């Protein structure tokens, strides 16, 4: 489905999805 599968991944995108932007997309 989609209901948790959107919620769960948006949370993974904080815990590690910040450091990868602090690596490739912005890298400050």
UniProtKB/Swiss-Prot annotation:
The keyword Disulfide bond applies. Coiled coil: none annotated. Keywords: Antibiotic, Antimicrobial, Disulfide bond, Membrane, Secreted, Signal, Target cell membrane, Target membrane, Toxin. One of its GO terms (cellular component) is extracellular region. One of its GO terms (molecular function) is toxin activity. The keyword Disulfide bond applies. Expressed by the venom gland. This full-length protein shows antibacterial activity against B.subtilis and K.pneumoniae. Also shows a potent inhibitory effect on the ookinete (ED(50) 0.7 uM) and gamete (ED(50) 10 uM) stages of Plasmodium berghei development. In addition, induces cell membrane disruption, leakage currents and cell death on HEK293 cell line (tested at 25 uM). Belongs to the long chain scorpion toxin family. Class 3 subfamily. Negative results: does not inhibit potassium channels Shaker and Kv7.1/KCNQ1, when tested at lower doses than those inducing cytolytic activity (18 uM). The recombinantly expressed N-terminal domain (AA 20-47) induces cell membrane disruption, leakage currents and cell death on HEK293 cell line (tested at 25 uM). Does not inhibit potassium channels Shaker and Kv7.1/KCNQ1 (tested at 18 uM). This is Scorpine. It comes from Pandinus imperator (Emperor scorpion). The chain holds residues 20 to 47 of 94 of the full protein.
């Amino acid at each position: 489905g989609w209901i948790n599968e959107e919620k769960i991944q948006k949370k993974i995108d904080e815990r590690m999805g910040n450091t990868v932007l602090g690596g490739m997309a912005k890298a400050i």
